[PDB]
Design a protein around this ligand. Structure first.
Ligand SMILES: CO[C@@H]1[C@@H](n2cc(-c3nc(Cl)cs3)nn2)[C@@H](O)[C@@H](CO)O[C@@H]1Sc1cc(Br)cnc1C#N
Ligand SMILES: [Cl-]
Ligand SMILES: [Cl-]
Ligand SMILES: [Cl-]
Ligand SMILES: [Cl-]
Ligand SMILES: [Cl-]
Ligand SMILES: [Mg+2]
Length: 138
């Protein structure tokens, strides 16, 4: 298994048609998972499944600019399960990140950070066994 937290460099940042694939298994008693697409210290796209926020499961997405979190976007559709293998795919589109989990569309997150070619790191962290993290063009 890969080390968590894991850094995946994104050389020259992201661009529309870039597909990022994360394979792993959720730990049995999970609390949270995070993907952080970073531009230096800023987080262009934070994707944060929470398994127990007020006894509900929710996806929180946000952006961090100058060390400050912005307005959260919430998705109540929650395809993860403690103990189970998952595939997260993040497809960069012109106006948004598109996320599919286990080959089913989950959400989109509109670009707040404009300089896509400076979003040069993906951090992966939280309650997972991480199998692989990769990217390709489509
Ligand atoms: C708890 O922190 C979380 C942040 N967070 C999660 C993680 C990690 N997850 C894993 Cl997995 C490993 S590390 N690190 N930072 C982030 O999810 C943020 C999204 O808006 O919400 C709160 S901070 C926050 C943001 C807003 Br807007 C309002 N209040 C608060 C607070 N407190
Ligand atoms: Cl590793
Ligand atoms: Cl920007
Ligand atoms: Cl760009
Ligand atoms: Cl970066
Ligand atoms: Cl790769
Ligand atoms: Mg540069």
């Amino acid at each position: 298994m890969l080390i968590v937290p894991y850094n995946l460099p994104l050389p020259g940042g992201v661009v529309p048609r870039m597909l990022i694939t994360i394979l792993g298994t959720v730990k049995p008693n999970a609390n949270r998972i995070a993907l952080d697409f970073q531009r230096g210290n800023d987080v262009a796209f934070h994707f944060n499944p929470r398994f127990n926020e007020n006894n509900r499961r929710v996806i929180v997405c946000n952006t961090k600019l100058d060390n400050n979190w912005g307005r959260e976007e919430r998705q109540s559709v929650f395809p993860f399960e403690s103990g189970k293998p998952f595939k997260i795919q993040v497809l960069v589109e012109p106006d948004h990140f598109k996320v599919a989990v286990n080959d089913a569309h989950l959400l989109q997150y509109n670009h707040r950070v404009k300089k896509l070619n400076e979003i040069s790191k993906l951090g992966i962290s939280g309650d997972i066994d991480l199998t692989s993290a990769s990217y390709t063009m489509i």
